[PDB]
From a paper:
The PEDV S consists of an S1 subunit, an S2 subunit, a transmembrane domain (TM), and a cytosolic tail. The D0 modulates the enteric tropism of PEDV by binding to sialic acids (SAs) on the surface of enterocytes.
We further obtained recombinant S protein of the PT52 strain using the porcine IPEC-J2 intestinal epithelial cell line, which is the native host cell line for PEDV. Having obtained the recombinant PEDV PT52 S from the IPEC-J2 cells, we subsequently determined its cryo-EM structure to a nominal resolution of 3.1 Å without imposing a symmetry constraint. The D0-up conformation of the recombinant PEDV PT52 S also differed slightly from that derived from intact viral particles. Despite the variations in the glycoforms between the IPEC-J2 cell- and HEK293F cell-derived PEDV PT52 S, the atomic structure of IPEC-J2 cell-derived PEDV PT52 S perfectly fits to the most representative (82% of the total population) cryo-EM map of HEK293F cell-derived PEDV PT52 S, which adopted a D0UUU arrangement with a lower nominal resolution of 4.5 Å due to preferred orientation issues and smaller data size.
Numbering used by the authors:
A (entry chain A): 761 to 859
B (entry chain A): 909 to 1015, 1026 to 1155
C (entry chain B): 464 to 507, 638 to 958
D (entry chain B): 1008 to 1015, 1026 to 1191, 1202 to 1254
E (entry chain A): 1206 to 1254
Write the structure that this text describes.
Amino acid sequence: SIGYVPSQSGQVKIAPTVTGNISIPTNFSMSIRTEYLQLYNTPVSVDCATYVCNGNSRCKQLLTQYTAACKTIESALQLSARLESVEVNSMLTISEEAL
Amino acid sequence: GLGTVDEDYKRCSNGRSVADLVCAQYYSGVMVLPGVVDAEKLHMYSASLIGGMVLGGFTAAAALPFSYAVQARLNYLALQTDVLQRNQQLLAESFNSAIGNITSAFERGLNTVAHALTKVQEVVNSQGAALTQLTVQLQHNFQAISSSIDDIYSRLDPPSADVQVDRLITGRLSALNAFVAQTLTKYTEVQASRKLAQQKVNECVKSQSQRYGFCGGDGEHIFSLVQAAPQGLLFLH
Amino acid sequence: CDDPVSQLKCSQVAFDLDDGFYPFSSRNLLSHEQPISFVTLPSFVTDVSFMTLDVCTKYTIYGFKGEGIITLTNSSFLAGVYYTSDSGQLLAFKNVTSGAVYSVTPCSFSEQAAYVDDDIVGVISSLSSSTFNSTRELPGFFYHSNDGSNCTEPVLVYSNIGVCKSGSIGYVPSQSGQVKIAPTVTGNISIPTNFSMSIRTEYLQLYNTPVSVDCATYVCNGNSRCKQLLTQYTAACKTIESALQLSARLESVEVNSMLTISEEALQLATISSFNGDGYNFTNVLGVSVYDPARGRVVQKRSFIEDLLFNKVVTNGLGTVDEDYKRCSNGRSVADLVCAQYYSGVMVLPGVVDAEKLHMYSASLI
Amino acid sequence: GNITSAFERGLNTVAHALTKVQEVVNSQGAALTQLTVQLQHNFQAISSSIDDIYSRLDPPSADVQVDRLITGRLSALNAFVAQTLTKYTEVQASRKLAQQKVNECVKSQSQRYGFCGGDGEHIFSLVQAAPQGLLFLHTVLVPSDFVDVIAIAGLCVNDEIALTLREPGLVLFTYFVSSRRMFEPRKPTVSDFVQIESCVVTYVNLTRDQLPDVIPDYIDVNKTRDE
Amino acid sequence: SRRMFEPRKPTVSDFVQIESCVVTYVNLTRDQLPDVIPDYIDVNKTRDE
Ligand SMILES: *[C@@H]1O[C@H](CO)[C@@H](O[C@@H]2O[C@H](CO)[C@@H](O[C@@H]3O[C@H](CO)[C@@H](O)[C@H](O)[C@@H]3O)[C@H](O)[C@H]2NC(C)=O)[C@H](O)[C@H]1NC(C)=O
Ligand SMILES: *[C@@H]1O[C@H](CO)[C@@H](O[C@@H]2O[C@H](CO)[C@@H](O[C@@H]3O[C@H](CO)[C@@H](O)[C@H](O)[C@@H]3O)[C@H](O)[C@H]2NC(C)=O)[C@H](O)[C@H]1NC(C)=O
Ligand SMILES: *[C@@H]1O[C@H](CO)[C@@H](O[C@@H]2O[C@H](CO)[C@@H](O[C@@H]3O[C@H](CO)[C@@H](O)[C@H](O)[C@@H]3O)[C@H](O)[C@H]2NC(C)=O)[C@H](O)[C@H]1NC(C)=O
Ligand SMILES: *[C@@H]1O[C@H](CO[C@@H]2O[C@@H](C)[C@@H](O)[C@@H](O)[C@@H]2O)[C@@H](O[C@@H]2O[C@H](CO)[C@@H](O)[C@H](O)[C@H]2NC(C)=O)[C@H](O)[C@H]1NC(C)=O
Ligand SMILES: *[C@@H]1O[C@H](CO[C@@H]2O[C@@H](C)[C@@H](O)[C@@H](O)[C@@H]2O)[C@@H](O[C@@H]2O[C@H](CO)[C@@H](O)[C@H](O)[C@H]2NC(C)=O)[C@H](O)[C@H]1NC(C)=O
Ligand SMILES: *[C@@H]1O[C@H](CO)[C@@H](O[C@@H]2O[C@H](CO)[C@@H](O)[C@H](O)[C@H]2NC(C)=O)[C@H](O)[C@H]1NC(C)=O
Ligand SMILES: *[C@@H]1O[C@H](CO)[C@@H](O[C@@H]2O[C@H](CO)[C@@H](O)[C@H](O)[C@H]2NC(C)=O)[C@H](O)[C@H]1NC(C)=O
Ligand SMILES: *[C@@H]1O[C@H](CO)[C@@H](O[C@@H]2O[C@H](CO)[C@@H](O)[C@H](O)[C@H]2NC(C)=O)[C@H](O)[C@H]1NC(C)=O
Ligand SMILES: *[C@@H]1O[C@H](CO)[C@@H](O)[C@H](O)[C@H]1NC(C)=O
Ligand SMILES: *[C@@H]1O[C@H](CO)[C@@H](O)[C@H](O)[C@H]1NC(C)=O
Ligand SMILES: *[C@@H]1O[C@H](CO)[C@@H](O)[C@H](O)[C@H]1NC(C)=O
Ligand SMILES: *[C@@H]1O[C@H](CO)[C@@H](O)[C@H](O)[C@H]1NC(C)=O
Ligand SMILES: *[C@@H]1O[C@H](CO)[C@@H](O)[C@H](O)[C@H]1NC(C)=O
Ligand SMILES: *[C@@H]1O[C@H](CO)[C@@H](O)[C@H](O)[C@H]1NC(C)=O
Ligand SMILES: *[C@@H]1O[C@H](CO)[C@@H](O)[C@H](O)[C@H]1NC(C)=O
């Protein structure tokens, strides 16, 4: 079946007042809402020379004429990986007392 | 099943066994290094947070019943003027029912278990897809006579061959640039998520949040407790 | 190009390399003298196949040409004669006369040289032996270095590992963070005290340098005939220029509205006016004197700002942003900026100079 | 002074900030040079010069040949634009955080734990200029030691009046009242306490005569009438 | 509290002086005040007895 997704009714939040009729929420119940947040990516290092030239000595000479493209690939990949590594290694602080 | 399956290249240069996919792509210069933190350290971090919301002091002698921590967090948002026992078991009963219901769900919409499962599945699938796309580009002969550089040099004269191999050097180097561009996009998405995750734990897990709706949608947030997950965290607000 | 360190630098065409992990090629046979290997199906009958095992050889295997090492392997595949991966890459072939299968591997394997302190302190590799002291058998790879000790001060962190400046490798230990006291109603509690204040630093980028690219002159190089063919591509050039311009304008308006400066706060931002009684703000504040340069009073950057600008900026100062007024002269040989301007690339000045940026910083302080 | 010397480890330290600054000043030049070197390549055409192609070849075949350059250079130009858009998107999120950082940490003191300079109680923060951005120095208070005390849930006087603290972030320990964030002991005052309908077992049991010892500011209305 | 129903008897420390009354305020006298606020101490009454 197909259907328009109905507009789910939200949880009413009382606007603060000064006087008059008001409603105070009461008899609460705790519901758990889950949220997945990604922390890191698996680092990948690509050897540009052997990927393109397939280890051919004569093809590497032609690749040298492309200057810094075959270098910027590797530089960008490893730099991104290093930033991820330092960020999540500093982020994860562990206390043995809490463990 | 487990993160320890992450393959090793020690046996990859051995050459006494037919190469599997990992070795077949390592022969093309692609090396997939291990993730920054394994599931054990990630689970330790999750357990550290869960155990720290009940650490009432410097030493372990200040361990608290979890009801006391919940009671303090309730007083944080509204001073409990009638603290009856029944008033506390109602919340405990609701939490026990709700936590089991997530457990059954693991075995619909945003901020629910089903949405989290789809995100986790995409996370574990995305990295493999990009690498396979990179490795499959080698078979394409980018308007050359063949996809093998040595084959081209055997068939043609060095002057003409240099033109043909330059077609696939351009083709492969362009395919390599596409892989990097979509990897940087992934790294920027994760950086935004990791900054939020550190923001989330500091304001929802290690303390109670006064920002309405920040920790898991609408309602008054009492506490949040974290669990490990493939390449990230799972917050239960 | 003699030293492997020099080999790495020349591959990166740079005299100085920043610390990091650099891809590297396994040292192959210095004396090549590669034997020729040839394997093909029998014809007519007659078999002319011949091959050399365990030696880097120039091979032709059933039409697959390359260079690699042929090694007898213990598999017993029953179908076919030669085997490839899903990507059509030759992995193994079969000695059809006896049925044994030989795997084909590259003669050289990719490696990662750990370059810190202007030296190759270690090599991440798949091979167990190299030209170092010792090899540590990490779970995924071998690590060769001249220091097998434990790494406790990782100068360069990468994936799950960290390497010190002495070449030692180790795991990054789980740092013990600052403890936070969970609130409670009763029982023993601990109130923190003896507070000491520590500064943590964070750098946040605000803008990029706008770049305007005249796609017509970049692509057609001013050739009028080529512009006619470029017009057949419709809006490709149009959208390139539009994207660049819109990005620059959004960033420009955002950071001009962001950087609000108050005059009175500036008056209190000088070393003479500020009084951090007990708090040494000399390194944080910048001096300001009447400048003979057009009379306008100039406020020099603070000591930390000078340290952060001079030692990092490759041109020394932000005022080195070149001007294109002298580019159209043509009476001198073009430098890098003029050469790229002749190709239709114009690097306009950043939205705010260091002076207004430093003025904003002093205003907040 | 240590920050100043360090400019002459890990995240949220001077070393990480310096590495980020160097990448910022290097990234822009790298992209432009990679763009301008694409003109050197001839994308499977006779030459990288359009005029040379037109001079060497006939008009019909020359148009095909220059289509290699037009497509090749235009694709190389699209890659540069895509790379700048990524940096513009990254910087846009960076300056939005910086605008939140200055508004909530520099121009005011932030309640959000860990927002201004990692863990610790953020007291203030100051800003310095940096290449194409701001260097934030967040000063956070770190406690050297901890005072171990016994937190009291509240008072129950004459087994009739339950009397508890009003401020959630305040503790009544052994009697003193102090902030739960820093050890600033203080004598309890009747304004710090509020009456509660129902007492509990965890409250300290007290009598009306013993209460003024706990709260010296308490006024015993009726005892002061029978005098 | 406006976030939870936690009824509580008013305390003298919960209230604070205001320069001018307004029409929306509840109209009271010093005899009714201790009933509304049990914690209130009538200085004149407690001194005149
Ligand atoms: C809330 O506000 C309303 C108006 O703003 C106050 O008026 C009360 O409104 C209810 C709802 O109509 C009245 O109840 C019913 O009134 C109708 C009128 O004909 C009649 O069928 C019954 O008398 C029934 O009770 C209520 O009488 C009315 N009260 C007054 C004093 O006007 C209301 O007092 C406020 N508070 C509450 C708790 O509702
Ligand atoms: C594929 O497998 C076949 C069969 O194993 C290989 O042929 C074998 O080659 C060896 C040496 O070339 C033969 O050894 C023989 O030894 C005797 C006694 O010393 C000598 O008189 C012969 O002249 C020969 O050297 C062996 O008999 C032969 N096996 C056969 C023919 O069944 C072959 O080398 C393998 N590789 C290919 C075809 O590339
Ligand atoms: C934190 O709570 C624990 C219990 O939850 C308290 O530990 C108890 O402290 C008392 C008095 O210090 C101990 O009584 C006596 O201890 C001394 C040695 O210190 C010795 O003469 C006897 O063993 C006697 O029992 C009691 O044993 C101890 N209970 C334990 C450790 O399980 C502690 O006092 C609280 N913290 C503070 C600062 O009071
Ligand atoms: C503080 O008083 C409470 C109130 O209990 C009553 O008063 C006591 C003085 C005693 O006479 C109790 O029997 C009275 O019921 C005390 O709470 C009692 O604690 C004991 C401990 O074993 C328990 O058996 C009773 O059931 C409790 N009474 C209740 C819950 O109504 C409490 O122990 C006194 N002391 C402290 C430090 O709180
Ligand atoms: C509460 O008092 C205000 C203040 O008015 C004075 O006090 C009254 C008790 C009465 O004695 C008035 O005559 C006094 O002037 C009352 O406000 C009055 O409201 C009426 C109704 O509209 C109006 O006609 C008067 O002018 C107002 N007097 C003012 C503004 O001084 C109010 O009605 C009293 N009751 C309530 C429920 O607010
Ligand atoms: C392994 O190689 C290292 C690197 O040289 C050696 O360690 C030092 O080497 C220098 C000269 O190469 C000597 O002067 C030092 O005495 C060496 N030891 C130090 C600095 O502690 C080492 O000798 C080599 N052999 C091993 C480790 O067995
Ligand atoms: C270097 O680090 C490794 C990884 O922890 C150490 O390996 C183990 O360390 C523990 C430390 O408690 C020892 O109990 C184990 O016996 C060690 N096992 C092995 C196989 O070494 C290692 O000891 C550290 N030191 C050195 C010199 O390698
Ligand atoms: C505050 O910082 C200033 C930095 O300018 C300190 O002054 C310098 O201190 C060094 C000590 O290593 C001397 O060598 C310099 O000659 C001083 N003057 C300069 C650099 O201009 C000062 O000591 C610090 N403390 C204060 C002012 O109390
Ligand atoms: C919760 O409180 C409301 C209003 O006070 C009441 O109507 C309801 O029955 C209560 N829920 C229970 C007792 O489960
Ligand atoms: C799951 O939730 C429903 C309604 O929210 C509840 O009735 C049910 O008891 C829960 N499941 C369990 C096992 O408690
Ligand atoms: C031969 O092959 C088997 C797998 O079939 C392998 O386990 C063994 O190590 C190999 N080498 C031998 C038996 O020397
Ligand atoms: C740290 O706090 C403790 C409180 O237990 C105190 O005894 C000590 O003197 C303090 N350290 C100082 C003031 O250097
Ligand atoms: C070149 O040198 C001559 C010296 O006589 C001088 O007059 C002229 O201005 C110079 N031109 C440039 C472009 O430097
Ligand atoms: C406390 O004051 C009330 C109010 O007047 C009075 O009824 C009571 O007797 C007093 N308490 C004692 C112990 O006299
Ligand atoms: C209450 O007492 C004060 C001071 O004793 C006096 O100024 C005031 O007039 C008195 N009020 C009444 C209504 O008696």
